[PDB]
């Protein structure tokens, strides 16, 4: 049971806490006396249950939980996939190819290029840039249930930071095991955010819509809207940077309406420690806190778009 409270700051009532200062009992190295230590969890990590406010971990009623080791890192490194003897991997080398159909210029290789396993949603990060015009690929364009994978030609510079000098409390749940709690925050209480150059994003989006009219009629209206709803991993730009798992609001990137014919875009980002990626139940990972302000610069190299069924099809 977590006896939590608001983080030390000064109002307003619209700050909705977000950060919780949880105090609780804990087992020490010995199997006798307990331990009254406190930690700092995000609101997305906790959930109240019905005297002061008492909470619990959001995964305790779903599955077990294991802490990620601080020795390993979640930094995506290039991985070449190779085929054994007697086998071979063919590579299509045309500048224009929607992934399906006959390929004019085919070459063979033993190992593919370095493909970094970057796990993200909505925005494709650190991927391979397309040739000439940006590419549009889909299993079935006529089917609005099939996703539309977009590949960029010019990368869109994106900057994400964690303006919170966190502290790692290493409380000892011995013998052997040790939990890494979040101590007090040094400095100002700020929220994570991502910046996208308004100039770059305007040209890139306008370069995509010109390719969308090649499939949805030359003189048609293309409108961009945010997600419909559901899980946090689907409605937000989920990614990893510096060990933390960000969840950014993409309502500022897909807020446009294109007809037939100087700063940065800041995006509200949330941070969750207890995650369950790949739609997996039974294995919940608690990402340990990271000391110091985290900064990362990535490449927006593609999008994952979906089309609505409301139609009115030959119009917009």
């Amino acid at each position, epitope marked *: 049971t977590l006896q939590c409270t608001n983080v030390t700051n000064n109002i307003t009532d619209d700050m909705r806490g977000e950060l919780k200062n949880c105090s609780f009992n804990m087992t020490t190295e010995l199997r006798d006396k307990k331990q009254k230590v406190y930690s700092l969890f995000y609101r997305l990590d906790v959930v109240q249950i019905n005297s002061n406010k008492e909470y619990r971990l959001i995964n305790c009623n779903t599955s077990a939980i294991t802490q990620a080791c601080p020795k390993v890192s979640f930094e995506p490194i290039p991985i070449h996939y190779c085929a054994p003897a007697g086998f071979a991997i063919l590579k299509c080398k045309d500048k224009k190819f929607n992934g399906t159909g006959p390929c004019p210029s085919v070459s063979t290789v033993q190992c593919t290029h370095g493909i970094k396993p970057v796990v993200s949603t909505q925005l494709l990060l650190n991927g391979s840039l397309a040739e000439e015009e940006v590419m549009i690929r889909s299993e079935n364009i006529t089917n609005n249930a099939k996703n539309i994978l977009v590949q960029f030609n010019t990368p869109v510079q994106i900057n994400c930071t964690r303006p919170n000098n966190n502290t790692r409390k290493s409380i000892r749940i011995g013998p052997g095991q040790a939990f890494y709690a979040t101590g007090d925050i040094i400095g*100002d*209480i*700020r929220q994570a955010h991502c910046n996208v150059s308004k100039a770059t994003w305007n040209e890139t989006l306008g370069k995509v819509v010109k390719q969308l009219r090649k499939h949805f009629g030359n003189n048609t209206i293309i409108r961009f809207a945010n997600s419909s709803g559901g899980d946090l991993e689907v409605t937000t730009h989920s990614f990893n940077c510096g060990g933390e798992f960000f969840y950014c609001n993409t309502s500022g990137l897909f807020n446009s309406t294109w007809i037939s014919n100087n700063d940065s875009i800041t995006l509200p980002c949330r941070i969750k420690q207890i995650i369950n990626m790949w739609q997996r139940i039974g294995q919940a990972m608690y990402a340990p806190p990271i000391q110091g302000v985290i900064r990362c610069v990535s490449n927006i190299t593609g999008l994952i778009l979906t089309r609505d069924g409301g139609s009115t099809n030959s119009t917009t």
Partner: antibody
Amino acid sequence: QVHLQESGPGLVKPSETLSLTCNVSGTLVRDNYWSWIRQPLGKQPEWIGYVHDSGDTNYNPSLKSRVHLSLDKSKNLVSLRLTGVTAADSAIYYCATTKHGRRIYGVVAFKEWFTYFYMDVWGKGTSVTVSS
Amino acid sequence: APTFVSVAPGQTARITCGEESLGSRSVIWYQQRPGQAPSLIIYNNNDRPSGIPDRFSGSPGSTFGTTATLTITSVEAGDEADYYCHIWDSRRPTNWVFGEGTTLIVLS
């Protein structure tokens, strides 16, 4: 030049209503912020509250339900009212102009900032003693 | 509650007021001559208004975990007075009471 002058009764009975007035000369009371500061003998100054036009007026949470401020644009002066006075209110009340400032530490757009006030031009001050 | 700081003439005086910084601050300093009204010396950590010499400097409100410090170079007999501070912390509520003052003693 900016000259400020405070004037009051000097003596107020317990459980009564203290009324003070800050006569302002050299500037208009509508184009500035106005704050009141009191200070007991041998203690640190205590901020009472600031008053401004367009309804922008806030008080001291400790003296919230007893203090009242107002601005007379016709007579060009600042007023003060304190109901239910005690021996703890016996101090020296000052009238000073107030200039606002904005301290930015975050990203501005996310309201990651705060406004700070500071008095630059004070007055001579008035003496208020509470005794029966 | 009261504190004292004695500094020889021509030297450098240092004044500590308020609690330790928890966030980004905007410390406002004030000087109160005996028998007079408090006067503004330094607002916004280290910004002096018109009429105040550059001898008076304050610690920047960007250092986390330190107290507000008022530095007075070339200490003169005229600087002998009380000094209060108004702490504006982004982690602390609005302080409606100035910090406990510090008396500057000019020796000799």
